[PDB]
Amino acid sequence: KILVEPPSVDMTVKILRSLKSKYENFYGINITDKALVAAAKISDRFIKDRYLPDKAIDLL
Amino acid sequence: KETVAYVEAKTHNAMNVDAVYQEHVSYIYLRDSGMPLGSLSFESSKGALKLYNSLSKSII
């Protein structure tokens, strides 16, 4: 049993911020940096069945 | 004894040690149990005395 931890939302900001190069080169459309933080923090208080990296990445 | 005295201020990170001390084993138990980012146990002999002032900053 190696326990895999939840990735602690302020780190998922750092995950998606590292992923700015890939999605903007995937389909071209510029992504604001306000909404990247807002893609994670609004995913907390509202969505429950999914969790932190799935919520932060599927919405983009 | 300087390497023994090195242990208590460098509990879980020692970085040049050819020996298995007691606090190496206790790292692994925390590493295996549900121990998050650097807590009380990671703040051993330095941070566990800083608790009464910490909770005073949150609760007065």
Side-chain angles (χ1 to χ4, degrees):
Chain A
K1 296 183 187 180
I2 296 173
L3 295 175
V4 176
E5 294 181 354
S8 72
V9 185
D10 292 329
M11 298 299 287
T12 62
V13 175
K14 294 182 180 180
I15 296 170
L16 295 175
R17 188 176 290 170
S18 66
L19 295 174
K20 290 177 67 65
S21 66
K22 292 182 181 179
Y23 294 98
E24 291 178 352
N25 292 319
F26 182 74
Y27 62 100
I29 297 164
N30 291 320
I31 298 169
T32 63
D33 295 330
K34 296 183 182 181
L36 290 172
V37 176
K41 289 179 180 178
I42 301 171
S43 69
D44 291 332
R45 298 295 296 160
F46 292 101
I47 301 171
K48 299 295 291 182
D49 59 354
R50 293 180 178 90
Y51 294 97
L52 299 182
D54 288 337
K55 294 187 289 185
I57 292 169
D58 292 330
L59 293 174
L60 295 176
Chain B
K1 293 184 184 178
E2 290 176 356
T3 57
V4 173
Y6 181 77
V7 177
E8 293 86 3
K10 297 295 182 182
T11 61
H12 302 298
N13 298 320
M15 296 167 68
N16 296 112
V17 166
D18 291 335
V20 179
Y21 293 101
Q22 295 172 353
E23 294 184 355
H24 294 87
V25 179
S26 68
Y27 180 71
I28 293 163
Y29 181 69
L30 305 169
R31 186 181 61 84
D32 291 331
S33 66
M35 290 299 287
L37 295 173
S39 70
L40 306 168
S41 66
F42 296 97
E43 295 290 327
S44 294
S45 70
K46 183 185 286 186
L49 295 174
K50 290 192 288 289
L51 293 174
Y52 182 74
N53 291 318
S54 70
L55 291 173
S56 69
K57 291 182 180 179
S58 65
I59 299 180
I60 295 171

